[PDB]
């Protein structure tokens, strides 16, 4: 019928992926290996289809896939997978890449996820929070400018800041935090900003005398970033929720 010109066209589409950052096509001989008649009705192999998108999440997720961060000491390095993250929803992208598929005319999109934000853009751009727990220091990068960093203190080797892809949460002034050391403990803050789902985030440290250097080895926190009080004032006056936090 009108279906063998549609058949060759569909095997004909340019299929693009956009996914965090990334982009690229779906192999034609991929799309003509998925091609289905039957019945008189023009479809694609559903099973290679949610493989392929099976495959896309276990690619990228960035739920289980760490993140590759150029930070301003190091160089390059790995920050493992965080509280900042997002995972493809197979069977919903694999209907909808069937639907776009099907419709013969060539297209890209990034997939259906679930965290964070959406992967048609990278997970970190150029406005975030580094917190090198190596040199014991911590920037504010905003529009690929520094805009504010400072030496800090990380957790103590009992009790280690976790390294991580977080993100700034929620924003809090005046608020106790609470814990255990067994023995329970206050801590009062000006100004507070978790960034993972255990208690760990960055806030005012009234009570510590110098910051930097190996301080934390001797005088770490329970994990939270205690960061200068002035400093930590001017930084939540300007970090808004929803900041990437990178800690290594």
């Known amino acids: 019928k009108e279906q063998l010109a549609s058949m060759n066209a569909i095997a004909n589409v340019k299929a693009t992926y956009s996914i965090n950052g990334e982009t690229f096509q779906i192999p034609s001989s991929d799309i003509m290996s998925w ?6 009705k023009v479809d ?3 099973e290679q289809v949610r493989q392929y998108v099976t495959d896309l999440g276990t690619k990228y997720n960035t739920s289980t896939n760490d ?16 509280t900042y993250s997002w995972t493809i929803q197979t069977d919903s992208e694999t209907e909808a890449l ?13 997939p259906i996820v679930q965290g964070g934000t959406t992967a048609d853009h990278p997970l970190i751009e150029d406005t975030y929070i580094e917190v090198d727990l190596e040199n014991q220091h911590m920037w504010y990068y905003k529009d690929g400018k520094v805009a504010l960093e400072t030496d800090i203190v990380s957790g103590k080797p009992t009790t280690p800041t976790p390294a991580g892809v977080f993100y700034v949460w929620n924003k809090e002034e005046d608020a106790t935090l609470k814990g255990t050391n067994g023995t329970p403990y206050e801590s009062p803050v000006n100004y507070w900003m978790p960034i993972d789902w255990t208690g760990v985030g960055i806030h005012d440290s009234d009570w510590q005398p110098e910051y930097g250097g190996d301080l934390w080895k ?8 205690n960061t200068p ?10 970090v808004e929720k929803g900041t990437p936090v990178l800690v290594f």
């Open 35 to 40: 091609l289905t008649y039957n019945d008189g």
């Open 44 to 46: 694609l192999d559903t």
């Open 67 to 82: 993140t590759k961060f150029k930070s301003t000491k190091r160089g390059e390095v790995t920050v493992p997978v965080g």
């Open 98 to 110: 069937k639907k776009a598929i099907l419709a013969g005319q060539d297209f890209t999109r990034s």
């Open 218 to 225: 001797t005088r770490g926190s329970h994990g939270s970033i």
């Open 229 to 238: 009080p002035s400093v930590m004032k001017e930084l939540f006056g300007m």
